[PDB]
Amino acid sequence: SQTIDKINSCYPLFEQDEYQELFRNKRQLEEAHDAQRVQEVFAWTTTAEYEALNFRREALTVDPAKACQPLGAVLCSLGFANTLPYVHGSQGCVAYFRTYFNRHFKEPIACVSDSMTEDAAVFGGNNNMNLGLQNASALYKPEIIAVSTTCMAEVIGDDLQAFIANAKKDGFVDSSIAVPHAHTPSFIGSHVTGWDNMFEGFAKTFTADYQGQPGKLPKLNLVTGFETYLGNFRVLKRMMEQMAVPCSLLSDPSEVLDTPADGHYRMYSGGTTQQEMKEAPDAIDTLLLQPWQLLKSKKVVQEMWNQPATEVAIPLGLAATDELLMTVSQLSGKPIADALTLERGRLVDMMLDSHTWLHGKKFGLYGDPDFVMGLTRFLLELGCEPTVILSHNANKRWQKAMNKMLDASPYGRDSEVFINCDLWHFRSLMFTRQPDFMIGNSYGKFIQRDTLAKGKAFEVPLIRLGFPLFDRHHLHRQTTWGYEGAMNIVTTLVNAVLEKLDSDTSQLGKTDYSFDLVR
Amino acid sequence: SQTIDKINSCYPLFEQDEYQELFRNKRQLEEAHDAQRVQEVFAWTTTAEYEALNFRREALTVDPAKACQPLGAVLCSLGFANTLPYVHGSQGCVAYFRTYFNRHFKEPIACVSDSMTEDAAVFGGNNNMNLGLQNASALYKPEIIAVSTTCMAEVIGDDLQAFIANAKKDGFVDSSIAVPHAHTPSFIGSHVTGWDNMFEGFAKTFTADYQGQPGKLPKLNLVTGFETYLGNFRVLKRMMEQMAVPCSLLSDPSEVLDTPADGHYRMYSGGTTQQEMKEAPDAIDTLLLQPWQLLKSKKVVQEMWNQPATEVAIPLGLAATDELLMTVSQLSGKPIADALTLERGRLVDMMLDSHTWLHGKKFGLYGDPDFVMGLTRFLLELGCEPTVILSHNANKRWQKAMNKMLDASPYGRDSEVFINCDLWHFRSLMFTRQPDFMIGNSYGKFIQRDTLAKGKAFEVPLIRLGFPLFDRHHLHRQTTWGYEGAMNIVTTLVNAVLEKLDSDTSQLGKTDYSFDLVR
Amino acid sequence: TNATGERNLALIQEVLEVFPETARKERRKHMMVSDPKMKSVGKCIISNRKSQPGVMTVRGCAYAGSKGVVFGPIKDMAHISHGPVGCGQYSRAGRRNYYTGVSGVDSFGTLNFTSDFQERDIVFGGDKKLSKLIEEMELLFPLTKGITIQSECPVGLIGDDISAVANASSKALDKPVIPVRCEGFRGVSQSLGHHIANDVVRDWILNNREGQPFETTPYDVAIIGDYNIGGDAWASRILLEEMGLRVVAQWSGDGTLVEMENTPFVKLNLVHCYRSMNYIARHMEEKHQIPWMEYNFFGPTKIAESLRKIADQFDDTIRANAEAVIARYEGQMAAIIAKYRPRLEGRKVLLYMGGLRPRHVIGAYEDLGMEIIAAGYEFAHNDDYDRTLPDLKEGTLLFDDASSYELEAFVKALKPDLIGSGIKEKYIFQKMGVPFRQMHSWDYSGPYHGYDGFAIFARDMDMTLNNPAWNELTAPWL
Amino acid sequence: TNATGERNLALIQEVLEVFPETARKERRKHMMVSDPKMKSVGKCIISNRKSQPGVMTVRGCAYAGSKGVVFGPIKDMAHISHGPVGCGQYSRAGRRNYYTGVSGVDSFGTLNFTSDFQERDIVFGGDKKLSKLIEEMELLFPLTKGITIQSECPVGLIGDDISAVANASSKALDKPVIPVRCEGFRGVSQSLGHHIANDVVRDWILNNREGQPFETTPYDVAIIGDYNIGGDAWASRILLEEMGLRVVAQWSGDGTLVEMENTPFVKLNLVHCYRSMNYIARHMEEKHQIPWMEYNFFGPTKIAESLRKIADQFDDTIRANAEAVIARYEGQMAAIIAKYRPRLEGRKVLLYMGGLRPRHVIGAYEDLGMEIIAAGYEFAHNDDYDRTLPDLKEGTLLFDDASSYELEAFVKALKPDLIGSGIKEKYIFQKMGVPFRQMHSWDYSGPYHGYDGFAIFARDMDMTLNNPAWNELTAPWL
Numbered sequence A, B: 001s002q003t004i005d006k007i008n009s010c011y012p013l014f015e016q017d018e019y020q021e022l023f024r025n026k027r028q029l030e031e032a033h034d035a036q037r038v039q040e041v042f043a044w045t046t047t048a049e050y051e052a053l054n055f056r057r058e059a060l061t062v063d064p065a066k067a068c069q070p071l072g073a074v075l076c077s078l079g080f081a082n083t084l085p086y087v088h089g090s091q092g093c094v095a096y097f098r099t100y101f102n103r104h105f106k107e108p109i110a111c112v113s114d115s116m117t118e119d120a121a122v123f124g125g126n127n128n129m130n131l132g133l134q135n136a137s138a139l140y141k142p143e144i145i146a147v148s149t150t151c152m153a154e155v156i157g158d159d160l161q162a163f164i165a166n167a168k169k170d171g172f173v174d175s176s177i178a179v180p181h182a183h184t185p186s187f188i189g190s191h192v193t194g195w196d197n198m199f200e201g202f203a204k205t206f207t208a209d210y211q212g213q214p215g216k217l218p219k220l221n222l223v224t225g226f227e228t229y230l231g232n233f234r235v236l237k238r239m240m241e242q243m244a245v246p247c248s249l250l251s252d253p254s255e256v257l258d259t260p261a262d263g264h265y266r267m268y269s270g271g272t273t274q275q276e277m278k279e280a281p282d283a284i285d286t287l288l289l290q291p292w293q294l295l296k297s298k299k300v301v302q303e304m305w306n307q308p309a310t311e312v313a314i315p316l317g318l319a320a321t322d323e324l325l326m327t328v329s330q331l332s333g334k335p336i337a338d339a340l341t342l343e344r345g346r347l348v349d350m351m352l353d354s355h356t357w358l359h360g361k362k363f364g365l366y367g368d369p370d371f372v373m374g375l376t377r378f379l380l381e382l383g384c385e386p387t388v389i390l391s392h393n394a395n396k397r398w399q400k401a402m403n404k405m406l407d408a409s410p411y412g413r414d415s416e417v418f419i420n421c422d423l424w425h426f427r428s429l430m431f432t433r434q435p436d437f438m439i440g441n442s443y444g445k446f447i448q449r450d451t452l453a454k455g456k457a458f459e460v461p462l463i464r465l466g467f468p469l470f471d472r473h474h475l476h477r478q479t480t481w482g483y484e485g486a487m488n489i490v491t492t493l494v495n496a497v498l499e500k501l502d503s504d505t506s507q508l509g510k511t512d513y514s515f516d517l518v519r
Numbered sequence C, D: 001t002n003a004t005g006e007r008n009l010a011l012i013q014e015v016l017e018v019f020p021e022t023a024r025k026e027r028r029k030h031m032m033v034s035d036p037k038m039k040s041v042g043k044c045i046i047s048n049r050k051s052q053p054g055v056m057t058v059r060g061c062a063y064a065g066s067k068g069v070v071f072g073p074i075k076d077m078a079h080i081s082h083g084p085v086g087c088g089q090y091s092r093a094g095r096r097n098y099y100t101g102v103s104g105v106d107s108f109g110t111l112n113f114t115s116d117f118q119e120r121d122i123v124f125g126g127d128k129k130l131s132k133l134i135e136e137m138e139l140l141f142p143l144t145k146g147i148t149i150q151s152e153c154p155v156g157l158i159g160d161d162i163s164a165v166a167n168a169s170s171k172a173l174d175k176p177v178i179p180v181r182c183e184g185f186r187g188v189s190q191s192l193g194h195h196i197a198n199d200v201v202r203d204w205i206l207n208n209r210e211g212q213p214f215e216t217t218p219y220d221v222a223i224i225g226d227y228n229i230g231g232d233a234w235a236s237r238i239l240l241e242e243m244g245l246r247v248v249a250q251w252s253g254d255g256t257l258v259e260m261e262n263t264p265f266v267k268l269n270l271v272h273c274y275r276s277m278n279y280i281a282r283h284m285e286e287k288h289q290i291p292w293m294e295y296n297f298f299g300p301t302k303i304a305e306s307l308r309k310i311a312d313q314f315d316d317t318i319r320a321n322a323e324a325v326i327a328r329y330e331g332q333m334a335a336i337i338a339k340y341r342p343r344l345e346g347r348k349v350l351l352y353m354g355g356l357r358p359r360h361v362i363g364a365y366e367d368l369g370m371e372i373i374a375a376g377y378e379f380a381h382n383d384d385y386d387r388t389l390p391d392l393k394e395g396t397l398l399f400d401d402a403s404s405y406e407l408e409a410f411v412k413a414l415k416p417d418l419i420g421s422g423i424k425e426k427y428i429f430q431k432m433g434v435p436f437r438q439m440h441s442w443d444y445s446g447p448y449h450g451y452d453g454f455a456i457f458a459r460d461m462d463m464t465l466n467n468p469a470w471n472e473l474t475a476p477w478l
């Protein structure tokens, strides 16, 4: 039942008495385990004996914290001008990639498939590739068609390079259109690997025949890798402009993922121009801002472009941003802008104002390897303890480097780093190690729910930082890098602490002796 | 007792057994009313019966939502270059004014008193003034000493203009130090009145005798009025630079409220220069961005400076930002910048993307008159209903214009506007009209707690927008004006909705059928 | 045809002019203009064909159709995405197929279980990994009732034999372990995953209780093809028990393995999604002699038609009961129509969804005085297009598996007042300034089925069509 | 003096050179360097003088001492800020004088009641307004035990008579209605507000239960002058009760009218804050023959000295109980010193607070191996500087009512490792790069009294002093 003046959606409609009885009555027909048994099993999953069994897994994966290569290749491709991502292979993949980015960015995502089916499974997808490049060119008129693969095309061994060579010899795709390509096998690496593989494809396509000279142009190239905060592309362009140091981001989807709602759909908008990618080899140097995933990128820079590839850390937090600015200054010969020094000092001030609420807080965190490394380093700088650090797609060399950095800090003494482990592993850790909060993406909401069900004292609240963020709006517009980004982070961490403390102290007559007005 | 590995602060130390027992024992010594009687009286304070009694008050004020004049004067004064706020009167006031801003901005606040004591009701405070201006000069070396008054001095009737002319003539203070003054009685109007009276003193001191010519300088002046979000000062300069229209904010404290923590204390930073104030009458016009409180400032612009005082609404929301920009374009003859059109269309895209969660949501809000009118307007533009609207310091003219705006909109049909009411009145309206959410300053946390004590079904969650904000950190750095500020308000509102909906659906096995991953 | 039908045939020619001539001629056969006289589409439209490469179709794969649509929703079973990590991740909790239960303990729908294939598994195969996986699953998730294995692209291509694994594990576990060969390259869309899933249910589940004692009633029924999106199947089930029927099972929104095994004991199968679950309904009619019928719980007109035609399968008691259910909700339905009809009437709607909703929601729109001017499916078959003809006005554009190019070009030309479609279309049309409602996930709202749903539907359509933001797309100075 | 004392005497001369001649010669008598051989300050320092005009003093006003400090905390009485709006608003819930109770129902400490003077009240007086005000309070807040009227500046200036109102309203309600003439222009600081408040307690509260029965015990005490900042009074009372005493009243943190009325029946008054409540302790000694003693519950050395001295006023059972209580908490004290003393010893501290804390926390810093290099008060009297003298090393700068300018100049020159002071000083010194702890509000932590407080205290000094941010004030290219 509904009233005309008080329409309820699903929640809280199903809380009504009639549906609670419907549920009670449906339950007799499902042969449900009894309540007591389900409670016993739930409690058992919160214990250290269960955690032990959970860490014995060697085959089963439950609630992974990573996606497949081609997703990353699509995102890299979207960052170049007038580019259409094209995933050679099965069409279900593309429907999913588009949806996954649609829900995080709340924006339209252009990507096509060449729809390989059972017929292509025996003949190979060459006819699909020819006809697919022809149709895509006609309908969508891109300057660039950026080709990646699905797992079906990888398993059958489609010879991508030969297929596109035929399409161009045989007139399926005009000579005007560039067609960079990369193999992006889903059963290797993750979405961050696909981004790097796609980047490599663009470098080969646009500069493999150039005779470059580092420093012909007095600029720096910046490479982000897989990055889903629009603010981070914009902050880097802003900081470089304040340094007065020419710069090109190589792959920048921040304009096509933020077009205006003005009556017109714009498929293409902004992005790195062909001129920016072709003149890359003449820059002073290219800085690879997520080092752990830009592996093939680092080889382009050093081996193809003969540039230094000056190591930099992800520019997250106060010391990593100082290091990026010092690197830009010493490579460029230009002084750090007073506006950037001023900004630094404002961030320091925020850190000092808020240090008594963060000091000694214990956090669990998960995400991609560069992000986790940078966030962990910044928590250490804040006097916080990153007690449970997980990166499902990190490798052992990354884990050694994490442990070295934790070992050198007072705040990393109780910290444990886990790779090749998923969110069901992370759930056990939240019940066993009980940090104060957890930092992660929207899949973390299910762990917060599970911890709360053990009790209000066991709840570990989620702080949303990462990808994907599907259950809050417009967090993709934030910045997490540079000093602007560090201010956002500090602000999110200390207000998470305060919101949780106000909740804990808001019981009238019971815990509100400490419901203070001033914090 | 405390354990060495896990030291507890006040909460939750006082939850331990030993203290619960200590409290049980102390209560036998207080002659406490019976818990049942207390709960009966709580329950009664939540009813319509009690609300009728509460709204019959004529003499008692409970939890006011306004402050006194001199607070406003101090804030106006801080916005001028090398100025030292000076409050002639009793020193208790100045401790309180510095504290109040310290806790909102988390920054140092320079203000001085002349410490008027019982000797001045009979003798007047001329001696205090003479010595106070001499000492303030010597210690702090200002270029300008901005003189306002406490209520003691108002009752007493001290003639500031005379005392100041006697201080320079006798040599207590140097003649090249500018000493603007204003009577700021606390028993008239509120802190917004004080800001406007202080602004009229500055304009008299710097422009009284000037032969101005509007349009001699192709610039616009902007006057914000009492405004405590740093971001709003910054966004206005940024938009004016995009429009390519020269501009001066008259009273801009954003630099002195945000100095860096770099090893030095700087008492004075940035702020409106004396040149800018002296040349103010030659601008094309002066825009008064909070029109309901800038009453005497309007007389300055119009009567002293002979400028139009083009009427503009507070630039909060889409439509009021459009209006401000067309007004700047009409007065300057310059086009609206393309990057502003782009930002406007990204705001529209945000409002379209988040419309389903906001449409039809009911809000209670309170605050200063201009703030509350501007936020009400923008809530109506989003298809939300501001059902309970309160401004303790607002007048009947403002109330009439509010009801006019509300009666014109489809979304204002159930809206009730209250003036000269306080937060104890607001607390009864939250219990009887029960909006979904309330918008207000930190004093609203006590109403949230009260509605949560009646039951989880009746809790009205606070959304923090306004002043002061004491129980969260760094919110004073945000923007609420322009398209950038409207993006902040939209993201805050929709995420408050989704935070509450997540909380309500997070009960494992009971309400978590609607605990959706995607929202 | 009428003038509208002529404008639509001329729009069709114009839109297809951009396509290379082989694809143009193939796409011409996927669109037509309706005729109210027509009972069968015949030669006029073709469908369920491969998609044209490279055109940005909205279609998904067989895996989505099997794991995502049919088996995913069964709460008491754990579903294993067997293959590389992607497919299960993207489909994890995207579809709002509501259920109640204790997630990870007695209900497993929002968990993503996967065998996360690495290059070693492609090289040497995954059946050993899968067997071990099932052992670990049994240990860590003891309360499952059953386990399904949803194959992703590589499984079939590498020569794996999951049916041996499934038989072997089931005997070791003593619970049904069901193998689905729903690799995404099979078929042309989601539709073949439905069919594969129905045949798996016919062979591995449905007979499990044959000959077992089951206490029946004369009013026993099964709801078939209702995936409880936003609680739609609960909003349908409350009315069928309010009419005096006993809903012994729901397929598969909030469904269990036990309910599916009990289904062969009912008296009647009520099929809501024809497209996905007509195969098993037809099978239960052939083999168990259980009759079935299609119904439609969208809006007060279709609800009252369905309730009366279902209750005419029983006797006067249930027939009376239908009349008393309908009369008791009448006042509710009348005040919803009074309030929202005036706000909505006369506005024009373009619909484009999967395989059932584009025709099924028409009556609800017409109960609010709105008109459909274009209706399309991603993957429906010719029998769905047959089933669409009666509900369309003369000259309506009716089309199949549209590219994004085509969908935008129909919208710009028809200028609908409102569009109902999916998430991949939503943010395109919103930038074009066309009010849009997500008609797969109900834009995080619903339910829309039944009497309680119609009020939510009406409120939602009004909220979006008449929002104040749609007047703001153009800056005032332009 | 020693080489520190000499450096400090030249520092004094160097900081006072900026003052105009009148002021400079006056401000020189408000500083001194300490000499361990002196037992009273004599002529070396003057204090409790009027503030120099315009120097940016830290001091507040009489209303702050009376409403803010003494009466504000009593949770069972509603306290009316009588005057214009500003005062009660700035002081609403800013001091963490903790209490337990149901806010606005049986406890009123975080509500701001005020007569909100408008111009009409100034011109025509506010006495009729105040009388109506109290009637509205009784209707809406029926569980108050009593009502206090805290006068703001204008009240005495316009000729109001609040004693007449209180008397008339107290008959009418039949509850104490207490009038306080704590207008902010009286006195030079918060200090006279204390004195005015104790004098009101003396006349309107303390005699209320005279002649009436009370079941007394031999171990009955009152805690005088502990405002339960962060629950300090509770962390103190626990030890007194564990020693076998019965804490009949606490003044006034978590304090009630009832407890204050029962105070005249105690056996011993225990004064923590000498400055604010010595007046009433002295009067109860003279009128009721109740001895009183100062004590200090900051840090393990001071707590054990206080417990022993307090127990020594009773008999052998309580002397034994003091030894047991010390013994029970010795393991917790040892673990705190072993963990935090190494992280803090050697470090220098500068303290600047109101009227008690600048001397009272020194033993706690000294238990953590820290040294105080300068100590000042805002509004203390010469008897407070006398009590500070035993706890200072030779040549320590000791000062009174310093301007912001002076404090800044003292910090720049002395370079303390840590500063403890108030909210108005905090953000200036953090920008200078000096670790700072709020020593009035405990920087929203605490309690710091008692054995439980000392743990928190040590954790908090370590947190701020050794925080890693302190190393980043200088950009690394600078």
Ligand code: CFM
Binding pocket: C065, C069, C095, C190, C227, C229, C273, C274, C275, C276, C353, C354, C355, C356, C357, C358, C439, C440, C441
């Ligand atoms: S697009 Fe239904 S045949 Fe299938 S997931 Fe949606 S119109 Fe599907 S009704 Fe159903 S619950 Fe669906 S909405 Fe048949 S199940 S493959 Mo996308």
Ligand code: CFM
Binding pocket: D065, D069, D095, D190, D227, D229, D273, D274, D275, D276, D353, D354, D355, D356, D357, D358, D439, D440, D441
């Ligand atoms: S500044 Fe206490 S004589 Fe008074 S409010 Fe703080 S050093 Fe006061 S101990 Fe006390 S609880 Fe105080 S910390 Fe005496 S009450 S006028 Mo500001």
Ligand code: CLF
Binding pocket: B068, B069, B070, B090, B091, B092, B093, B094, B096, B149, B150, B151, B152, B186, D061, D062, D063, D064, D084, D085, D086, D087, D151, D152, D153, D182, D183, D184, D185
């Ligand atoms: S010294 Fe003390 S705090 Fe000052 S007024 Fe006097 S009692 Fe009060 Fe009050 S209203 Fe505002 S803050 Fe003042 S100007 Fe008057």
Ligand SMILES: [Cl-]
Binding pocket: A292, A293, A369, A393, A394, A395, A398
């Ligand atoms: Cl890695």
Ligand SMILES: [Cl-]
Binding pocket: B292, B293, B369, B393, B394, B395, B398
């Ligand atoms: Cl007003």
Ligand SMILES: [Mg+2]
Binding pocket: A105, A106, A107, B349, B350, B353, C427
């Ligand atoms: Mg968008």
Ligand SMILES: [Mg+2]
Binding pocket: A349, A350, A353, B105, B106, B107, D427
């Ligand atoms: Mg600060």
Ligand SMILES: [Mg+2]
Binding pocket: A027, A032, C100, C101, C102
């Ligand atoms: Mg259940």
